[PDB]
Design a binder for this molecule. Structure first.
Ligand SMILES: NC(=O)c1ccc[n+]([C@@H]2O[C@H](COP(=O)([O-])OP(=O)(O)OC[C@H]3O[C@@H](n4cnc5c(N)ncnc54)[C@H](O)[C@@H]3O)[C@@H](O)[C@H]2O)c1
Ligand SMILES: NC(=O)c1ccc[n+]([C@@H]2O[C@H](COP(=O)([O-])OP(=O)(O)OC[C@H]3O[C@@H](n4cnc5c(N)ncnc54)[C@H](O)[C@@H]3O)[C@@H](O)[C@H]2O)c1
Ligand SMILES: [Cl-]
Ligand SMILES: [Cl-]
Lengths: 361, 361
């Protein structure tokens, strides 16, 4: 079978780290296995433009392997041309770069599988880190040191402890729950969640969380809000001007989920106006983020409150080996004809939604 | 009585934030309270040089109030000129900017009091933040964004999860233990500590910590080392070239304790050479840190591994009110002649060591 693998290029950085499996140079470390199994592997990072390498090979690819950090956007237009496509794999977590609703509406017999759980710890750590960086005003503090300055008050005037703050997560699944678990020993005033899926009651009690029934009530009382739900029709553009106006004034917002859950310019305006004290995360729409994307230069009134990074929290070296192995396992389930996928990896099975986490179906 | 209060200046930043008690503009909230009692309060940030405002007032100061973030260095030379000095207060935690050994060894009848516990949560939070920032390679990641670039592999090549790492604290007192507590839900491989004061078994078991009684054995197995002991003769220069050569190669080192626990040039050489992958923290010797201090510009081979900030973790707005109130309480205990200090606040009582945490006596 013909397999098209779209990853980020490491360029000169490939020579620095052999454990960087998630790049085009290294092919998830599964190329030997795919060659021995008798398959043809096309590897590229060229995913934009009508004559990209991706588009040249879409018409007869049996399988497309993608990765969220450099996402091949498997649009309706591409799906219609993909005459042999039977399986799309996500080397990572989050399948929103594929037009899942289109596959489902047309009933096309395409399965979509992701490596659930492979980098959920990595993401939760990044949430905790970004919360602490924003609350404690770390970015301008480090900027002072490397700019050869020293002025404690310029940092302290907007630096707080996370202790005593009320923290809310939108989405309390694998990442959201792991965030709540990691926050417990920081002595927050309270931990809150909003999710149409209730936490198991034992899990709720372990972290002292309180479920809040609607999102407006959730954000209005939160000093810190974190977004940990997938991107789907019910979350696209969820964090917009109107909802942001119901946040607690001066809240901190963290989003390692998906960029498009927020309206980009609305977040930036809330930060510039003071409605938010800070925003940070690793995810953008689209990716790669253009040089002039508004989340790069946005700041609060003090010139800070920006903890943005490129999309990498789920591609730490520890995460990469896990989602590479999980990608291999998915492919093997397909190649053998067993289709013995782990239940939690299945987004679509031959066009049908199996996941419950991408809204109600 | 004549009181000399040495704090940092907030300048234009005082107007941005009324909760900034710890600057010369706002005088810990005690200026009118002192004036009403008939005391003369001299407030200054001018603390260096033979005719500094501090030195002008040392000879007849009854009380000197200091703060670690802008520390008046109460050296033996100054103590010898301080003919009326009876009490040095630390608005914060850590009394090493005072020559405690000289006071004690020469029979100077000077008490030294600090606001124990007032910002130990704040410091522990900063340790967790710095560990995450270094391990997850946040600083170059944010720099890439604000420089209008996008290259996931440039960051991922040296980005790890904290999960699965072995973490060691040198010092397991209020901050060190709070660090261990916050690390538990991050699923480290193991938590280790080295302290001449053992943790109670119950405290050890709560965080799953293992005591290591030899410092070289401790650092040799640790992916991450954090310093959480006071600065005294026993810890000054403890982190030198020879001990660093026994660190695990490519370890991360966090120091929010005191800068002079490390030999500054030895740390920088270890970072540049790769013996450390990263160093970070908020504390320097001396403070303010000179523009040429080697910890400003030091980097690892990738241009990263530096998470330095100015000394602010213990002067977040949440901390400042706690140590301002604690300073007022200490002063009242002195002025009333009750001397009913909280026992945990007493470093020296009339020259004698009461604390056990500054070495054995
Ligand atoms: N930044 C990264 O590198 C990275 C890494 C992993 C995952 N992610 C993203 O995080 C998302 C969540 O990952 P996970 O492992 O926690 O997934 P998960 O499926 O375990 O949990 C998602 C939770 O979100 C809930 N949810 C769905 N819609 C919601 C809505 N409108 N409001 C509130 N809750 C809603 C779901 O019910 C579920 O409980 C992924 O889908 C992915 O987009 C990013
Ligand atoms: N960066 C900040 O703003 C900030 C804030 C608060 C405290 N600090 C610094 O952190 C230090 C510790 O604070 P704390 O509240 O945890 O103090 P603490 O007195 O509760 O704990 C200090 C621990 O260090 C141990 N110790 C002393 N010498 C040691 C040695 N050679 N090796 C190993 N352990 C040793 C002590 O036995 C004690 O258990 C303070 O003295 C201060 O210098 C910095
Ligand atoms: Cl929904
Ligand atoms: Cl000692």
């Amino acid at each position: 079978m013909k397999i098209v693998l779209v990853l980020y290029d490491a360029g000169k950085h490939a020579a620095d780290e052999e454990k960087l499996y998630g790049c085009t140079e290294n092919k998830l470390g599964i190329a030997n296995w795919l060659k021995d199994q008798g398959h043809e592997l096309i590897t590229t990072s060229d995913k934009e433009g009508g004559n990209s390498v991706l588009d040249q090979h879409i018409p007869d690819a049996d399988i497309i392997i993608t990765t969220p950090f450099h996402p091949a956007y498997i649009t309706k237009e591409r799906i219609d041309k993909a005459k042999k496509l039977k399986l799309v794999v996500v080397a990572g977590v989050g399948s929103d770069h594929i037009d899942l609703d289109y596959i489902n509406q047309t009933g096309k017999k395409i399965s979509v599988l992701e490596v659930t759980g492979s980098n959920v710890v990595s993401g939760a750590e990044h949430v905790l880190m970004t919360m602490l960086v924003l609350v404690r005003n770390f970015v301008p503090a480090h900027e002072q040191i490397i700019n050869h300055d020293w002025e404690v008050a310029a940092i302290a005037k907007d630096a707080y402890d996370i202790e005593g703050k009320t923290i809310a997560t939108i989405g309390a699944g694998r990442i959201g729950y792991r965030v709540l678990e990691r926050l417990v020993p920081f002595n927050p005033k309270e931990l809150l969640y909003y999710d149409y899926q209730a936490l198991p009651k034992d899990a709720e009690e372990k972290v002292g969380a309180r479920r809040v029934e609607n999102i407006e009530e959730l954000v209005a009382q939160a000093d810190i809000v974190t977004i940990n739900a997938p991107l789907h029709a019910g979350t696209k553009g969820l964090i917009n001007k109107e909802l942001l106006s119901k946040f607690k004034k001066g809240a901190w917002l963290v989003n390692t989920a998906r960029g498009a859950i927020c309206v980009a310019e609305d977040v930036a305006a809330a930060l510039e106006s003071g409605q938010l004290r800070g925003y940070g995360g690793d995810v953008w729409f689209p990716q790669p983020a253009p040089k002039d994307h508004p989340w790069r230069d946005m700041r609060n009134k003090y010139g800070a409150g920006n903890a943005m990074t490129p999309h990498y929290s789920g591609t730490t070296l520890d995460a990469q080996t896990r989602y590479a192995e999980g990608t291999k396992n998915i492919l093997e389930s397909f190649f053998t004809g067993k289709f013995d996928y782990r239940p939690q990896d299945i987004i679509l099975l031959n066009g049908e939604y199996i996941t419950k986490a991408y809204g109600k179906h």
